Every structure is written in C-alpha cells, then in structure tokens.
Nucleic acid binder design. Sequence first.
RNA 1: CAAGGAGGUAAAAAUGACAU
RNA 2: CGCGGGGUGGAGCAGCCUGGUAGCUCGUCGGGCUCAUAACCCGAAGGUCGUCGGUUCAAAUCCGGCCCCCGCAACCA
RNA 3: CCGGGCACUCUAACGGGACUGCCCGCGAAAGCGGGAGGAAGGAGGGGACGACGUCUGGUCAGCAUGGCCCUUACGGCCUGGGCGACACACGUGCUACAAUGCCCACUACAAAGCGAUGCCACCCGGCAACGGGGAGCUAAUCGCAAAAAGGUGGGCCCAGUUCGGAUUGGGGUCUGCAACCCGACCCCAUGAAGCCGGAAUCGCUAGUAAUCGCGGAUCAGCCAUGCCGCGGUGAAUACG
Lengths: 118, 91, 155, 60, 206, 25
Amino acid sequence: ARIAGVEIPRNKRVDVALTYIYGIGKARAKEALEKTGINPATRVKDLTEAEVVRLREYVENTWKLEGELRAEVAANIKRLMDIGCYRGLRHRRGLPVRGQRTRTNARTRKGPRKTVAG
Amino acid sequence: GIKSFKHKGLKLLFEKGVTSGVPAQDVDRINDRLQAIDTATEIGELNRQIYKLHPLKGDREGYWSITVRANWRITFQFINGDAYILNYEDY
Amino acid sequence: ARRRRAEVRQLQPDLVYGDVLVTAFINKIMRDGKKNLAARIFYDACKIIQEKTGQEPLKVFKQAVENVKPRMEVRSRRVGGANYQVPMEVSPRRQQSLALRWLVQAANQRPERRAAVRIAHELMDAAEGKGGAVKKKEDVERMAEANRAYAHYRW
Amino acid sequence: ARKALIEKAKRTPKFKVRAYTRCVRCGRARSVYRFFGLCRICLRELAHKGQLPGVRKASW
Amino acid sequence: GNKIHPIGFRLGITRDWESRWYAGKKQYRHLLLEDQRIRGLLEKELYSAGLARVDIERAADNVAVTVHVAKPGVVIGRGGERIRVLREELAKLTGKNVALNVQEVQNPNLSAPLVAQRVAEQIERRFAVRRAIKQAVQRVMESGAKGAKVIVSGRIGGAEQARTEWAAQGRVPLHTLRANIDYGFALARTTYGVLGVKAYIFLGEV
Amino acid sequence: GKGDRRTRRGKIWRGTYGKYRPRKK
RNA sequence: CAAGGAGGUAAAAAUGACAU
RNA sequence: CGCGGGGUGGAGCAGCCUGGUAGCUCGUCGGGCUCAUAACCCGAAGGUCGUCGGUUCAAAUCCGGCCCCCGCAACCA
RNA sequence: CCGGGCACUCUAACGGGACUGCCCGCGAAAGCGGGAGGAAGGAGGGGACGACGUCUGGUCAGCAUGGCCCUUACGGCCUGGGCGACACACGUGCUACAAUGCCCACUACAAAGCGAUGCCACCCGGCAACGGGGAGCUAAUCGCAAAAAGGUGGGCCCAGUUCGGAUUGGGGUCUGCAACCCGACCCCAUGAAGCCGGAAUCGCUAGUAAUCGCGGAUCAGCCAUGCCGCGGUGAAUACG
Ligand SMILES: [Mg+2]
Ligand SMILES: [Mg+2]
Ligand SMILES: [Mg+2]
Ligand SMILES: [Mg+2]
Ligand SMILES: [Mg+2]
Ligand SMILES: [Mg+2]
Ligand SMILES: [Mg+2]
Ligand SMILES: [Mg+2]
Ligand SMILES: [Mg+2]
Ligand SMILES: [Mg+2]
Ligand SMILES: [Mg+2]
Ligand SMILES: [Mg+2]
Ligand SMILES: [Mg+2]
Ligand SMILES: [Mg+2]
Ligand SMILES: [Zn+2]
C-alpha cells in the first residue's frame, strides 16, 4: 500500500515493512503502530483497509520523511555553503566530517583507491 | 639546485642556517658540500677527490654518495641538474 | 623429526549410544568449541532418520561411514622436485578421519536450510551410496586408480 | 626542556587538569605508577636493589 | 649477555630486603621518597666510611637506620662529633625518630659493594686495571671466599675503544637459588668518561 | 552485531548500557 | 656370517652493497 | 625534382584492401618472492592513428592537398 | 537469617607425596619397553632462571657520563596551532559477509583483581546516556558485576535482506577553565562497502587451537578494537 512515497513491501510484517521508508527506521516503526493501535506481526498484504488508512494518515503526517526530509538534510549541508565553517569544507573536499584519521581508511567518503605511485 | 630534503638537520642548515642538526665541527664541511650539490649542473661536477663520489647499489640504486667525514655520507638522487632527497646517514 | 610416533588420541563415548565413533563425528560438527550445539544437531538428525526411514540411526550412520571410506589414496612423493604421485593404501585411522570429515563438509554443502536435515539426508544418501561425500570418496579413488603406473615406487 | 619541566610537574597550579604525574627518581613523564611515584624504569632498578619493601619477583 | 640482578633474583629466599617497612597506599609513595632521600643524603657525607648497606626499618614515626661500614672510623666517640648533628640533620625534612645505628662489617674483602668501590677508586687513581682486577679477586679469595668475580667494562685505561676486563676464581654459580652471592657495583668517574665495576662474592648455602 | 550500538550484544562489547541494554531489572 | 675391488650421481636457479 | 611503399600508446610491429571491434611483444605503474638486486609470479594504466581539407548517418580505414621517412629510376647522345 | 557447631567447602602456613624405588623382559653398564602401585608418574603440566661470546645491534629522548657546540640565546614563560594533516603504499588488528545465524524476553554456572581526595547498594526523574537523593564499605563484611558463549520461549526464512554496521543529518549527556581543529557515550533518522577474499602469507600438538565474556595498570576524561592477566565451553591431526 502506497503509504508515504513508497508501496513496495508486501507479505512481510508491518513493523518491518515500515522500515522500508527513509524516515522510519526501527524505533519510529513500532512507535507508529502502537500509537495507531495495529498488530505489528500482521501480513502487510493489504489487510484491513481501515488500519492501513489510519497508519498512512498518522505516519505520512506527524514527522517529516521520504523525499521531503532528504531535501531538508541536503539543505542542512547547504547551510555550510555560503562562507561556512570547517565542517562545510569537509563536505566540500569530500573528506570525513568528524575529524578522524584520513592517512589511511576514510574510503567510505573518499571512495575507492586511486594509487599515485612514486 | 637542491630541491628536496630527507634529513631535517641538513634541511635547516642550508635553508635557515640552523646548525643545531649537524655536528658542530662539520658545519663548514657540510656547507661547502651542499653548495656544491646546489651549484652542480651535472653529477660530473660533484667529482672532486675530497668527496669520494659513487652511486649506491642494490635497493639504493639511483642514489649517490659524497663523503663528509669518517663514516658519514650525504646521499641523494641527482637528475637533470638537480639533487633530491638529501640525506645525512651512516656509511 | 617425529622421534615419538605420536600415540592415537582416545575419546569419551557418547550418551545413549556408546559408539567410539559418533563422538568423533559430533566433534567435526562442533565449531568454536560448542559441543552442546554439535551433539544436539546430530541427535536431532537421528530423530530425522526415524521419519524418512524406519531404520535405527546407529546403523544408518555406521553404514554411511563405511561407504565413504577411501580404500586407496594418491600420495605425492620423491625424485624430480616431488613430481610423482604414488597411489598409497589408506590406514584404518585415516579412512576413519576422512569419512567423518567428508560427511560433515558435504553435509554443509547441501542446499537445505537446517543443519540437522543436512546431516540426516547426507547420511541417508551415503548409506545408500549416493551422497556428495561418496562422490568425494569415489573421486579420490579415481586419482589413485589413474596412477598405477609408478605405483611400484610404493614405499 | 627538562629541568624547567620537572619544575612544573611539582608546581601544579592553574587549572586542575594541567597537573600531571612525573617520576621522582628520574624526570620521566610516561609510564609513571601512582603507587610508587616512579617510572617503570626506576621501579625495576630499585626492585632489583631490594630497596622496595615487599616488592618481589613474580613467578607462577 | 643479559643476566638478572643476582640480588633481586633472591630477595625472598636468600638475601633479605634493605628497606623493611609496611604501609598501604597514600603513604607508600611519600615514605619511599623520604627513604630514598635518606639513602641519598647518607651516601654523600659517609662515603669515606665506605658503607656496604643502608638498612631501614619503620614503625609509625620510628625510622630506624642501620649503616654497615668496614671501618666506622667516622663516628669518633660520642661527643667527638661525626654523629651528633650528623644523625640529627636527617630530621630537617623528616622530624621523626632518627635512630641511626652503625655496624662493623668485619671483613671488607668479603663485602661486594666494598670490593667494587675499592676497584673503582683504583681506576680513578689511574691504576693498571687488569692487574687491579686480578689482585682484588685474589684478595677476596685470600679472605676465605668460596668464589669471586670482578668485571670492569668500557674505555679501559682511556684509549678510544670500549673494552671489558674479566677475572674470576673459584666458584660463582649465578643460576642457583641457594647461593648467598653478594653483588656490588660502582661508578668510576674519569677525565675520559665513566666505567662500571661489578663484583660478585660467593659463599656456600644449602 | 558486536559493533552495532543498538543491541544488547553491541552494548556489551562497547561496555556501556542504555535503552537497548538496561542496567538489569 | 663380515666387504674389498667395480658404475650409474644433484638441479634450472645469476649477482653483491657502499670509511681500512 | 620522375615512379613505388610508409607515418598508429615510450620502443618495435599488426589492424586499412571487405568503413561501425584499435590488438601483440617489450617497457612503464602497483603488489608479491629474497637480507637485497636481477630473474620470476599477480594486477593495472597507457594511443590527437603525421597533418590540412573532402565524401559519409559514421573515417585509423575511402578521396584530395601539402609535411617528413625509406626504396627504385635518371638511358641514346 | 538466628541458636549453636566448624566435620565438609574454602582461606593461607608449614608439611607429607616417587626417587622408574616394586614386577616381567632387554643390556656390560647407563637406559629403554611393558605391568598392577596410586591423584600423580621414567624431567606430571606450566613459570622464574638465558653459558663463553656474536651482531662497531639497540639505547646520549629515562637516567649517568667523555668530547663538541649554544648562552639577552639552541635557555625561560605564556596564548594559539601542530603531533590527529591525506592522491597514495605496507604492518599489526577489530567488525562482518550470516540460519551449527540474527533480534527480543526469561533464566542459570566463573575466576582473577580494584575501590572510603573512591567503589557507589536501594529508591526517585528520565525512552536512554545520566541527574537528584542516599545506605553500607578503612573492605574473604559493603560496592564494582548481571559474567558471556549456554538453556527455555518466541519472532525473522535466506533475499544485501530483522545479515552487515560504515558514512552523514538532527537532538542530547558527562568529564573538563575549555572538547572547532581533536573526547567517550546516549537517542531518533540514515543505512555504505562487503555474498568469504589474486600472487602470496601466519598461528597453534591437550585445556592446547578455536570461541566467550571478566578484571587491572595508565587514567579528570579518552580515541583501548592495544597491552598485561582471569576463567567459561572445548576440537582436528601427526604415516612419516
Ligand atoms: Mg584527523
Ligand atoms: Mg604520567
Ligand atoms: Mg653484473
Ligand atoms: Mg613492479
Ligand atoms: Mg626483483
Ligand atoms: Mg648511340
Ligand atoms: Mg640502349
Ligand atoms: Mg636451570
Ligand atoms: Mg651502530
Ligand atoms: Mg644526556
Ligand atoms: Mg603519533
Ligand atoms: Mg554491492
Ligand atoms: Mg546470501
Ligand atoms: Mg610444541
Ligand atoms: Zn624515572
């Protein structure tokens, strides 16, 4: 069911199916279905349409999620555009933000190795 | 022209005149050698008898070695009128 | 230089069976030193044997080992920078070890989901002479078969 | 910087976190045991001397 | 080479301590520093006595200090000085019961610290070291010893080349625990550097 | 998941406690 | 029982370093 | 200056004729092996196809103009 | 827990206990093989212990020290920066790629050590880190700690997935004068690479390898996945 921006997860437990949304994770998941009052271990296969409506209405509202909060997150990094701080430059150069070790490692932001040789 | 240092003491003696990285009695010695390696336009100029010049062998191939005093050497790579990796080391 | 001929290690007999063999098999099942999980899996699979066949697992397991026994194996030896492969006989100690090892390995090679059903099935297949371990056994005997040429180098 | 540096180690004023341990027999700042007030080097010396009450070789 | 200090190697069985007091934390550190400063202050103005040991015992403000010496010539009869303010100058940073005793080490030729110290004096007298070693060993061996061994290392007789002079008569088993082996050491200060003298003295045990 | 800060197992490994591993009872 | 006199002989594997 | 052939990674060579894929050995760069160097093993990168135009949907390739390189020819007086 | 008792367990202090002494066989002897003998054996299992010497090994940055040099400075104080930099290369590791596995709940079983300028029971606020209280403990008394792998129950169902946790946004806490450069945790959201590793290369022969957690030093805090220890479960194989 097209809950937020997504619909994908069929026969696979609503507490888990919920996770498949940028903004839900695991904590907001069971938090949303206990506050909406729905059984977590259900089929996800389009069960009681009412439960699905209530779920959708609560989840999609309340807190920001999916493409909207991706925009906000990207905009929070755009904050350090202008004449920003040190943390912005780390987002500029493509290097780790939290001042860690970059002599080795840091491949998750630098990307795969390039090898200079000399 | 000297272009890069590997030894910090050597680096400081030639750049700032900081002598506290080398032996005190080898200050003048090391200086005249470095200036010679700086002025040298080819390895053939670093050939005075008092230098005992020679290229190194094995893994140190591509390097050269003039003699300061006793068992002490200034090693470097000379290429296209310039020396690189100026080191001060045991024989 | 093996001054001592390294005496054969002896085991503790299991529960309910008294085997001088089953525990050796449970040991191969054992990973990270968890004999509890290891023994459980085997006895679990023993319960599984009872279902698909009306046979006592003490024979099903016994015969399976007997069918996955290498009569002769290939041995790489001397002269020519160790160039030859003399087909040697296999000691009862080594047939023992290879049988159980190949069983467990082939068992975890199977596409099944639970460790017990893999063990049970691989044992039933091996008892018949069908298991992937039996493949391994028959394969090792092919190698030993093709090298009868310089077998007379022996030793 | 060694003599004026074993001065500060006992001087200990100005912010409580700027104060640090320091071997007394030597002037070592590293591996200084709080129990003896000595570096691992000095401690070994005196332990072999016998000048360390109760301190004895460990074999087990 | 690499060999463990034959004193520390015993400590428990054979060869007892040299500073025998008990304390828990918050006290050990302070009392050990004071203890060591006593050893440091004594060694200075008491070297002419040549002290084999400096035993120390405590019992809450009691601080007993036993100074072993070959010849206690620097004590000189009660109020003849060399003890009065001398054993009283300790309590200028202590203020506790400065009970200073003096022992008479009978044979100095059987006291390892004294042997090595006599040798180290001779190095600074510009003596021939190899001959000095030989004599000192025999001198120790002459006074009833079961085994002896003296070692001077480095810069022997000046001359640019660190050497190591070696001599040892009788029996010196360092590996054995029931050993009763006395170990001494001394720094010889020379106008050309510093060299160390080891001295091993051995007697029976069981 | 010895390195995940959202498990009783990762909280053990890290040492610290929390929501995913309460200080007993 | 204890050996002398006879004959087939390893491979594919090179180099050397920085004052006496 | 008269004919014929040729310019393609750092080196030497294919691929052109039957337009749409540029491939080979060496070298270079990374990693192994060894105390170390060579040899050896694993793994990479690297080419405006001489140049200026033309044809074509598309040019290393087909057509012209120059520019070098190599080879033949230059005889009868 | 009390009365009372201390024979069991434990605590730590000295002792007893095998020396192939006893039997068979081999041998000239040393010794070897085998057997009842007992908890134990033919150095029982581990430590501490490292010959003469070798490497012009290491170490003047722990310390001592010869010689050279520096002295309105090569010394001294301070604030700030830096040792944490990153196109890359190597070592030692930690965490994984999952179902003999992961998550949640319940429920057991250790040793060795550390603490009243601290360890902090039990309550109270808090999703939690943690904060307020506040008892006991100069500690085989009180506290750090519930050991964890295990067991029971339940849920995922093999798909980069409830595997995996990197990276990044946001919100907090604690130490600290202060954590931007550079601290550790906590909570929400992101959820990357990895589906088991080329040429090569390492460790271990019995409580061992493998796997699991615990303690301590340094320490205001901590970049510790390190080092030094503790015990839990516990293989495989050795022809040669
Ligand atoms: Mg950094
Ligand atoms: Mg310190
Ligand atoms: Mg050659
Ligand atoms: Mg290469
Ligand atoms: Mg090579
Ligand atoms: Mg004519
Ligand atoms: Mg003609
Ligand atoms: Mg011994
Ligand atoms: Mg040297
Ligand atoms: Mg010094
Ligand atoms: Mg560093
Ligand atoms: Mg992928
Ligand atoms: Mg998979
Ligand atoms: Mg071994
Ligand atoms: Zn010190």
